[PDB]
């Protein structure tokens, strides 16, 4: 074991040297050309009320009109954000839902949490209501995040330090992704849905090729647990939020951190993260009940989405960049512009 | 306009159901249950039941519904799945008082300290079930206990005058059990600030009064929360 430890240390030193060699110029020294965007004075356009408990998760629809929200009151409520109307209200068998998903086709939602089971619900039944279409068991820890690739395949992250790619029709893990030491808190599919980055409670993110089932790259730099993660919209970078009150943008093709977003006044972690359509803004929800919009290129905060009465647990930006949504533990969703 | 009418009627049909479910959500008290498996926790669950990543127990006292959430098939790192349990009425923390991991009791002390000072659990009360009082009594009566080797402050600790020993209890038993309770209360009182309260109890795995203890503690918690709303506490 001593020889393997020494080889691991040598490989880590080699990787550090390789990362340092290609890091002659930082992001700011080049983005000084890019002009600042100024204050981003967004306002709450809609307030979605109906959840009786903290809304742990929320996901948009590809149409940028419908969205699904998951709450500890065990309700998966589907809101038409345009008219504030509720489209469906799924009672959950497990109240502790810590994640939810909306399929790209929109036919299926999903939910998971402390029950270790990822439940897939169908919104397009013959009756027209929503029932328990499928149950995907096989995780030995709490579900933290899940993402649909299609109507048949869904990728999930658990509290057992591993991710799992599920074939919905059969119910078996098409793939199992292992390599993290801490609990995996979030994941995000690439725009081409071929790679996905998962952040864990080891202060590290891992980029997995979905077809191979192997970890392509490991990105470090965070100091505490990583709570949320999301790709840059171009698909060749991503962002992470952690308990050390720093957001961190990495790039896959350089393997090393591009930018960090933190302030001295911020002493609370980032619980949710989501890029805008342009990739020029980065919306991060914080434990101090606020959500901040960061100028992802200039690394300075662009604005504050003040108005939430408790911890902001989740966010979501529309595909067309029309509107933002933020859930919270105040049981209120807020649609922002 | 037809689509808007259909959407509005569906939203009304959903909102009536949400109004119906709000009553049952507000009328049911959710309890977290925490502690090691060797501390008699599972026996407490069995006692409350006779009378998967998480296990539920639905019981009721005086027509009041209690929904207790035992944890199973989860990892030992609680720092991320504990934050889901702040809205609960209370955290029933079960301790093996006789288990002083050669020092399991110190592990319980540190876990309780972390729970007490967690920023999301700083408004959640803790009901403390020191569950191995009988085993502690057997250990201290036989003289092989010698809690001094595991806690030096046991010699200079003097039993408070407010202690209420059981009838027919060896004063060493009472002194040891109140020493452990005061070791917990040292953390509980410090950095408490009245936003959440600890309710140390001397329980046993086969007690029938555990449900009544939880009932009274939850009632007291709700009362004190209402008094904090009116700025009376």
């Amino acid at each position: 074991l001593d020889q393997l430890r020494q080889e691991a240390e040598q490989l880590k030193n080699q990787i550090r040297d390789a990362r340092k060699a290609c890091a002659d110029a930082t992001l700011s020294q080049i983005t000084n050309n890019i002009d600042p965007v100024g204050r981003i004075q967004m306002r709450t356009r809609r307030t979605l009320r109906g959840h009786l408990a903290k809304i742990y998760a929320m996901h948009w629809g590809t149409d940028s009109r419908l969205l699904v929200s998951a709450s500890q009151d065990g309700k998966l409520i589907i809101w038409d954000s345009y008219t504030t109307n509720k489209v469906h209200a799924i009672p959950l068998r497990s109240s502790w839902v810590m994640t939810c998903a909306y399929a790209p086709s929109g036919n299926y939602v999903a939910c998971g949490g402390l029950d270790n089971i990822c439940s897939i619900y169908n919104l397009k039944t013959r009756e027209g209501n929503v029932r328990v279409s499928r149950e995907l068991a096989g995780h030995t820890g709490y579900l933290s995040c899940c993402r649909f690739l299609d109507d048949n395949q869904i990728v999930t992250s658990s509290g057992d330090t591993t991710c799992a790619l599920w074939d919905i029709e059969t119910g078996q893990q098409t793939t199992t992704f292992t390599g993290h030491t801490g609990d995996v808190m979030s994941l995000s599919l690439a725009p081409d849905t071929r790679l996905f980055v998962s952040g864990a409670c080891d202060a590290s993110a891992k980029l997995w090729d979905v077809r191979e089932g192997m970890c392509r790259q490991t990105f470090t730099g965070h100091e505490s647990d990583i709570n949320a993660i999301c790709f840059f919209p171009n698909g060749n970078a991503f962002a992470t939020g952690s308990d050390d009150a720093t957001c961190r943008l990495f790039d896959l093709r350089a393997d090393q951190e591009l930018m960090t977003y933190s302030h001295d006044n911020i002493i609370c972690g980032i619980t949710s993260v989501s890029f805008s359509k342009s990739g020029r803004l980065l919306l991060a929800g914080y434990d101090d009940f606020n959500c901040n919009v960061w100028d992802a290129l200039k690394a300075d905060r662009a604005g504050v989405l003040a108005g939430h009465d408790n911890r902001v647990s989740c966010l979501g930006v529309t595909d067309d960049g029309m509107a933002v949504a933020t859930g919270s533990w105040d049981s209120f969703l807020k649609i922002w512009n | 306009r037809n689509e808007e009418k259909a959407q509005r009627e569906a939203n009304k049909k959903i909102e009536k159901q949400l109004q119906k479910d709000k009553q049952v959500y507000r009328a049911t008290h959710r309890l977290l249950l925490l502690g090691a498996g060797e501390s008699g926790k599972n026996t407490i669950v069995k006692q409350m039941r006779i009378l998967s990543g998480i296990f539920e127990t639905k019981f009721q006292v005086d027509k009041v519904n209690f929904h207790m959430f035992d944890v199973g098939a989860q990892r030992d790192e609680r720092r991320k799945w504990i934050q889901c349990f702040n809205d609960v009425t209370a955290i029933i923390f079960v301790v093996a008082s006789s288990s002083y991991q050669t020092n399991r009791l110190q592990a319980a002390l540190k876990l309780f300290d972390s729970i007490w000072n967690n920023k999301w659990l700083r408004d959640t009360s803790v009901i403390l079930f020191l569950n191995k009082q009988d085993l502690l009594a057997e250990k201290v009566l036989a003289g092989k206990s010698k809690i001094e080797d595991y806690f030096p402050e046991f010699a200079r600790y003097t039993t408070p005058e407010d202690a209420t020993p059981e009838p027919g209890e060896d004063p060493r038993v009472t002194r040891a059990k109140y020493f452990i309770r005061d070791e917990f209360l040292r953390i509980s009182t410090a950095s408490g600030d009245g936003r959440h309260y600890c309710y140390p109890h001397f329980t046993c795995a086969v007690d029938t009064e555990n449900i009544r203890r939880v009932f009274n503690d939850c009632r007291d918690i709700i009362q004190r929360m209402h008094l904090r709303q009116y700025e009376l506490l």
């Epitope: 330090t161 030491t181 801490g182 864990a200 409670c201 080891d202 202060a203 100091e223 505490s224 647990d225 308990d243 050390d244 009150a245 002493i267 972690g269 | 990892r75 030992d76 790192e77 609680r78 720092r79 504990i82 592990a107 540190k110 300290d113 972390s114 729970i115 007490w116 000072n117 967690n118 920023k119 950095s191």
Partner: nanobody, 126 residues
Amino acid sequence: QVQLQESGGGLVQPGGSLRLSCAASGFTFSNYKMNWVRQAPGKGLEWVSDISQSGASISYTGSVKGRFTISRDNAKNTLYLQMNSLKPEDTAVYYCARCPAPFTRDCFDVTSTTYAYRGQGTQVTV
């Protein structure tokens, strides 16, 4: 990456003295509470001592009170444990843990079976 490397462990006769040093790299030492934990041969992880951010607040387990002394040099980003009057039941692997989140009073999962922010440990045989 979070790196905690221990040194100073070794073989000592009962009643001897020793000094465990913990070098921390990859994080801001002054903002995290730090803990000394130990695993005895054939037993689970046990918590030995903890010290707060600035070092003002210090706590020890019962079995090491008076004997050992925890401290931390924030300028050198290191954690010290002065071992005095050692006993044969003090033989164990000593890991230098870190609290999971900064600025927070509570430390969770320092004595967990797989903790991501804990050192590799140093053997102390008495």
